[PDB]
Each structure stands twice: as structure tokens, then as C-alpha cells.
Design a protein around this nucleic acid. Sequence first.
RNA 1: ACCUCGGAGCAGAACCCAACCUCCGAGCAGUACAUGCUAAGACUUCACCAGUCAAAGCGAACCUCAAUUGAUCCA
Lengths: 80, 354, 95, 52, 49, 146, 41, 111
Amino acid sequence: HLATAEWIAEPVRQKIAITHKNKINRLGELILTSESSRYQFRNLADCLQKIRDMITEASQKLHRIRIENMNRERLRQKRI
Amino acid sequence: RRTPPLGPMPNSDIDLSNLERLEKYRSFDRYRRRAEQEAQAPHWWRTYREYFGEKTDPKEKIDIGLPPPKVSRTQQLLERKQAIQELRANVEEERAARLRTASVPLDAVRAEWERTCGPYHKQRLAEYYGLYRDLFHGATFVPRVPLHVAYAVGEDDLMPVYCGNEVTPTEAAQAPEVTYEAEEGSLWTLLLTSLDGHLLEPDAEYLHWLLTNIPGNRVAEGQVTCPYLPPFPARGSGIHRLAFLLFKQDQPIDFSEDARPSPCYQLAQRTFRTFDFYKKHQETMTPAGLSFFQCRWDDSVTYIFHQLLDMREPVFEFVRPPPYHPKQKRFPHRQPLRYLDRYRDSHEPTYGIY
Amino acid sequence: LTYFSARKGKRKTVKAVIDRFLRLHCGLWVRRKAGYKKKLWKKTPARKKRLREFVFCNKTQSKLLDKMTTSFWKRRNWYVDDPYQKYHDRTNLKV
Amino acid sequence: KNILVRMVSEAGTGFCFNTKRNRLREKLTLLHYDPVVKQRVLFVEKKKIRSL
Amino acid sequence: RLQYLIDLGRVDPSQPIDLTQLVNGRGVTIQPLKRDYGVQLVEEGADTF
Amino acid sequence: EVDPVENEAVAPEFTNRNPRNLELLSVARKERGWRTVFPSREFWHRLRVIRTQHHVEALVEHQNGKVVVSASTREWAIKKHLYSTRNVVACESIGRVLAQRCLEAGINFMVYQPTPWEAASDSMKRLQSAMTEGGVVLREPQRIYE
Amino acid sequence: QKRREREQHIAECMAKMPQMIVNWQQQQRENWEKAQADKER
Amino acid sequence: SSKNLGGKSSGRRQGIKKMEGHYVHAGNIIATQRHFRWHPGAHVGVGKNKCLYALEEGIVRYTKEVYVPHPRNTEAVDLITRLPKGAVLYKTFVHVVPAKPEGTFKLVAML
RNA sequence: ACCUCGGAGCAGAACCCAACCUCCGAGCAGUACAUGCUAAGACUUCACCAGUCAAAGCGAACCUCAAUUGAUCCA
Ligand SMILES: [Mg+2]
Ligand SMILES: [Mg+2]
Ligand SMILES: [Mg+2]
Ligand SMILES: [Mg+2]
């Protein structure tokens, strides 16, 4: 559960919420996966490294979407 | 051994007697036009059009539209011409055209384009997007009523639905403002339907709005037979189509078998088929307006799935078929250690019985 | 080759085969392309890469090299950091 | 008529490559891709290997 | 292999385990004349040890 | 057992029937090949300009051949503002009209394939400038093969 | 020490590099100018 | 005597490698040719020895199409502009009709 | 007299096909300096050796030619 994770500081916690809301379930817990090995030891190590990298990042196609959004603004331009 | 041709040869009607008399393509453009016409010609041999083009049935797709408006061609061409020579009599028009500094009013151009030729272009684009194939099973109609729809966002801002732009469901959360020019005493029905977006049925679609029995231009006084649900395209499911359908109704029609309840937040109850709707109600209304748009997943769509629809949000992703990799030989004669890597499963070392 | 040595009465090994070819334990032989260090100013880059590849051999060539080498070279070697450790075995090979 | 010549990098990486040039021309100076520094740097002619 | 030997009782876990105990339990075969330098503990089956 | 919601019945394979779906996801096929002929048919949408002796026609068409959007000086809505339908003013006007219609239709990326004399002509340069300042990009993005 | 001397020599050459880029480019342009003068002759 | 020398070169083994209706994979060479006998069509690429390979996986189809060269190809454009009016040049083209879709959308999570 | 490589006929239409058979050539030249790296799938001169094409990807940019050639060891 991301919000009730007291080992994570507050500002980094809402930063992780707004950054990895793609990985937040409806009950409010972060879910992280690893499949890169046939050893569950190494899979768990990868999951913990994902948690650690995610926390330290909080502590610290795109062209297509940009052009489509600019054209959407060009259609948006009309005032009342 | 020879076989005679099954039809006329291509360069057969050209006379080969003396080649110096015949007129000639001196231009690649002229040859390109002639070759494109010959490519569009049917032909009796095998053709890229035969193997790749869409084989639609020659059913001469039926018109279920309104009859076209009648115009007097003689006075129409008279007024068009007199506009032409008054503009050609204005002296500064020549100066602007020759100095290449002239311009054109796009708002007036677009308004009377909607007046004159906009319905046929809108019908063509609807056929390209495939609503007449999906929503109406092949049948076509020319949309003869301009269905201007915009979405109230911000406090001064409008997100429109003309004929297929991208509108995010953040902008499509609330009910859009609709106007279409009309006269008193004529009834209407407006419909919003999401064609792509049915999470279970690959054939059916979703009804998002079924406003019925509209007195006129006023769209706030009709029967709300289904509340507006904002579009919810699933994440990674691609770009979905939503259609506004406007129907001219002559008589009042009871809508009791198609009356969605007080707030209806069930996808099974919101399942719809416009084909069955128009089949049941065919002798009652005739479609006259059509305005569609496209939508993608958003944080709004997450909100609509989670709190409104009481749903766990489905996640889809686009995955490719696995590569070919032919049957593995015992002696890969001139292949590499990369061939062995191709047929390997796991990248980690194995030790067998040890 | 020497099928029976004059000193031990044993089959001998061809050291040309030893210093030219590498035998994986699965039964395959790995070699280099002939002329991979010759006339690279003449050779085109795709051809140069094709010559820089490591390639396998025929069934016939592999059988010849197995006959020319002794059974010491066919053993399983558990080297410390062998780059061909993952190539020493066949995976998903049907018939 | 021609000669095969070795041109080394000016990045000091020790990278070098062989091209051909007419014998009656001067020492070559080219802009070639150096993979050690991952960019295009000057190479100039240091040696002649053989006659072409 | 180590867990199999321990469970079959060929290797005593209550005593320190070295090359003598592994060879006496016949879990490994060591050929020092064939340039073997000992036993490397590899990671196969770390999930069930 | 927890009673499953009847709304939670989702198919394990989504079926998106939008003809623009994979094209806008940039995972759709472009018809590669035809390297020995002209024009190249590796595109999704194409701008084609027909300069007849009276009129200037401009089409946005898919690779299959259906016309997506059209804009002509043949129409009154353009005739009543042009002095003549054969100018670079005519081409600039039809470019501004067609750029607006393409923004309206959602066609943001296209491939324009002119001949050398077309591209060197002032009409097509004013056409491309009008399209670019209207808002459409005359270069399609690359297909995502992997 | 050997790696550090190597990378220092590379870093020095690369610090000096862009000026050699631009002066060799203008030298090549001057070669083209003398070539067009000679074929103008 | 017999002052004729050379001419001992073997056959090139060129020609069609994949006929009509044959299932083809991506990268399989369809035809090898010294001159442009068969032209590339849809989803068929050409390699610099004029070889034809399948750019996609599907069914090989041989069709006959009109020939419009590139306006920079000088010899071809001269032949076209020297062709009399009413005549359209034809060539034989090779296509690969792709068999599978590019991919599928399938369920991966229930967030 | 010839010995290696390529093109045309013999060998008319998938492939292949000989003669101290009939003709013509080759043992380079020019451009470039990403002519960088890498990697699915294939072709193959009837073996092998050798040779040929190439999707995607990284990084950049925004080759012509028909043959035009020589293995290992060793230096
Ligand atoms: Mg011959
Ligand atoms: Mg022969
Ligand atoms: Mg072969
Ligand atoms: Mg590539």
C-alpha cells in the first residue's frame, strides 16, 4: 500500500503516486513484477531494485503525441 | 506452344503502319495520366487491385437519407457568374493576384462549404472511417443537417466534434452543447454511440446517449432515455470511434424497449446495436446528421472505470507473433553460435545432473 | 593418422585439427572462415563481417575431425569462464 | 597509378584505416567516423603500404 | 545435488563439509590429473535449498 | 467465494475495428516495395494535386485508394473568392482550405510525392508552406516494427 | 596509470578537435575555390 | 588452332525460387535475375544484384501492371516521352500478400 | 596450342548441360570516407572451400561496374 508506507517520506510518496499511477491498483497498492530470471531470488532482487530506483528517482511516439496535441489546441482555439 | 489472349491487348488499337504520323506523349505527366486511367481500367489478367483491393459487393449501397434539396441551376449559374465578373471588375483583385498577395476568407468558405458540398464530403469520410459498414451494415446516407457540437471545457473554452478529431474524455466528461438549424414542429432524436470499446462483444457497441423526441433547436427539453456516460477506451486498446447520430422524426415515437434506467452504469444494459434500432424504428425516422470523433485512454477514463462503473480497469497491450525460426538441424553447416542462441530458451547457465 | 603408435600402441591426434578447430561437447565443430585476414581493402564490409563470423561444419566434416582426434578432446571441460559453455549443449533439438 | 595508404585518427585513439589514392596527389586528410570516441574526427595519411 | 545428498544421508550436515566429505559421499568426482582445481558451488535450485 | 461483477466479463482479446487504429498507433503496415516505379506506395495517406487547365484539385487519399478529403477550385466556395482558379494564389487558397479540412478530419500526417518540376514550381511551394502553417505535417512518422 | 594517460591524451585531442574540424573544412572550401578558378581558366 | 578462348563459366542458377501461391517468410529470396525480368511490387524488396526478396510473410502473387518510371530515370523517361500516344507500358510484378495481422490486443492486467 | 574469371549461341520456355565448338571480353577504373556496428530470413555455380542478397535494431544522414581475382603455413 503506497499511501500507508511510512518508510517512504511524504513528498517522494505523492511523487511516486503521480509518476507510477500506471502501476497502482484500485485498492491503493503499488504492484511490481519481475520475470527476467528462472530464480525467484533474482526476481525478488530485481523487484527490490525497482523499488529502490523508484524511491531515489523521486528523491532526485512522443513526437506524434505532441503534434496531435498541438493540432488539438489548433482546433481548441475558439472562444465564446 | 501459344495461347491466344482472352481479351484485347493493351497497345493493340494503336496503328503501327508508320510511327512518325501519330501524336506523341512529350510529357511524363501525360503518360502518367494515361497510365493511371489504364490502371483503373478493369483488365482480364491478374491485378494488384484484384489481390489487394477491397472486394465489396456490387449491391449499390442503399440511400436511407433525406431527399436532396432542389436548386434552380439556371439562376444559380447566373448569380455565380455575376459574382465572377464583379470580382474580375474590381481592379485591385488583378493587382493582388499578379503581385501574389491575395487571400481568401476561410470562415465564409467553410460556412458555405457546409451549405453546398460539405454533406457529400462528410458522407465520404464516414465511409472511409467505416460507420456505414459497422454502424449501418453497408447502407449509406448523405448527412443533410449540420450537427454542430462542442464540449464546454474551462469557462470560455469549447472542444468540438466535427467529423473525426481526437477528443480526450477529460474534455468529454460532461454533456456537449449541440446546435443544428431547424424549423418549428419537426421532431428529432440524437444518439451517441461508441463503436469500438465493447470489452466483451466483438460485434456490439456501447450506447452513451439516447436523447429522444426533440422539439427543435432546443436540446435541453427532450426525453433523457439514457444519461450521458463519458467515453471509456481501455488503456493500450488503441483509438476508438464515437458517433453522434441525428434523426429527423415526423411523428412521436414511444421509446420504452430502449429506455435505459435512472443512472444506468451497467455495460450489459448499455449494450446497443444501431442496426437493430433502425430496423425496429425504420418507418419512423430518417438520419440527417452525423458527427463522429476519436478518443484515447486518460486519467479521466481511469476515474470513470474505478469510481463510476465500479470496475477494475482492464489493461491491454499490443503484442506481436513470435519470429519464424525454422526447424533446428543437428549440423547447422554454415550457421553461427547465434543460430544456437536463436534456439536457446534461457539465458542463464544450466548444469544438468551436476 | 597413426592408428597404432610405435611406443604405446594407441591412436594419435592430428594437431593441425587441434589448433584449427574447436569441438563443442554436443558433437559440433566450430571454425573460422578462410581468408578472413586477407585483402580487406578488396573486401566489402558485408563480406568482411561474413568472414569474421564463427561457423560450424558438415556432418561429414565433423565425423572426419572426430576420427582425426582422440577421445581426450571429446570430454566435458568445466572451464572457469569459457565463452562456449552455453554452446556446449543443444536445446529444443528434435531428431 | 594508385596506392593503398594507412590513415590514423587525430583523436589519439590509435584507430586507423586503409584507403586508396592517386600517387600524384598530396597527403590525404579526411573526416572519418572514429568508433573509439563514437564520432567523426579527422584522419590524415601517415603511411603507404603498397602500390595499386 | 547438495540437498539430495543431505536428504539421502550421504553427507552429514552436523559436521563441516569439505572436499573429503563430498568425495566420500560420492556427490562429486574429482580428477586432479585432468586439471580440476576443486568444486564450484553453482546456483541451480537455490529456491528449494 | 467472492461474487464476480457481471460487468467485469472482459474478453481476453480486444477487437478494435477502427481502420485508423493501427495507423495512429504506428504499428500498421506500410506497403513497402515498388522501388522500380513511381510513385512510392509506402505511406498511409497521400496528398495528390491535379493541376488541370481550368482548376486546381487537391486530394487526401489512403493507400487503398479511397479519397479521404478533397478540396477543389471547382467548388463555388473557393470560386467566389478567387480571381482565377489557376494561380499560385489558387494553390495557396486550396492549401489553406485543405489544411483546415485535414485538421478537422484528424489527418495530421501525410506523404506528398511531387515530380521535380512540381516541387520546383512556385504553386507547390506555396501549397506546402500553406499546409505547414495550417498545421499538417507532410512527413509521416516511421512504422514501429519492434 | 596507463589507462589514465591514454584517456588524458584522448581528452586533450578531443578538446583541440573542433578547431581542426572548422579549419580543415575552410581549407577544403579553399581547395574547391582554387579548383573552380582553375576550371574557369 | 581454335583461337576461341574463355566461355567456360558455369550456369548462374538464377531464376524463380518461389512460384505463384507459395508460402513465403520475411527475407526469403523470391527470384534472382541478371536483368529486371520481374519487377518488385507490394511487400517485395530488391537487393543491389537486382534480387527479389519477401519483405513480409505471406503468399507470392505474380501480376501484370502498368509501368511508370521515376522522373529522374533518364533512359526510361526518354523511352516514355518517345512512346506514342495511347500506349501504356506493362511489366510483370511480384507481390507478397501478407497472411497474418501485425499483432493482437490482449488482456494483461486487471488494475 | 591451351590451363583462372565473365557475357552470348549450342542449351528457343524452371534449373543444369560438353567438344583442341562458334564469337566477345576480364587480371581495372571512378566516386565516397558511417565504404560504421549489428542482426531475422534466405540464395549458392551441382561436394567442400569460397561467394551473394537482406528486414528490423544501435549510431549517422535528412556506391557505379560483368569478370576486374589467390587458401593454408610463414614473413
Ligand atoms: Mg558459356
Ligand atoms: Mg561448364
Ligand atoms: Mg550449394
Ligand atoms: Mg535497416
